[PDB]
Amino acid sequence: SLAKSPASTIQILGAEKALFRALKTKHDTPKYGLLYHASLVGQATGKNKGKIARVLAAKAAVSLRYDALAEDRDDSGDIGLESRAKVENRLSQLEGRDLRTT
């Protein structure tokens, strides 16, 4: 039931009361939810923790529905590990940029 949910839901999955009050009046929705306490979002700083909460929820949807829907799964962490490498170098490339002018 978690695997058949879209990645945006997996992003906002913990923050339902903030989400639905910010939808039932026309306000801005949260961006973290239950996924805020992941170590990668801990490594991010600024608005790009919203950004990598989004990319982490996307890769977590990929890995999660692989885990729930695979049959020849090996319990070895391969898809989760390549997804984590994707999220880590993405976090690198948006922590390398800086809004200052040098």
């Binding site: 170098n89 690198s92 490339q93 390398g96």
Partner: protein
């Protein structure tokens, strides 16, 4: 037949990788306490 020799000379040219602006930006993350020969083959993997 010098045109045929020139065409086989330009025909025996193989596809290579060109340097971009950002072909080497992701090396600072792992220049930490690795050895310099591992850096050389990490660069050569980018060039090839």
């Amino acid at each position: 037949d010098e045109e045929d020799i020139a065409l086989e000379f330009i025909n025996g040219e193989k596809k290579d990788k060109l340097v971009n602006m950002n072909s080497f930006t992701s090396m600072f993350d792992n220049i930490q306490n690795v050895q310099m020969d591992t850096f050389f083959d990490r660069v050569m993997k980018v060039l090839t």
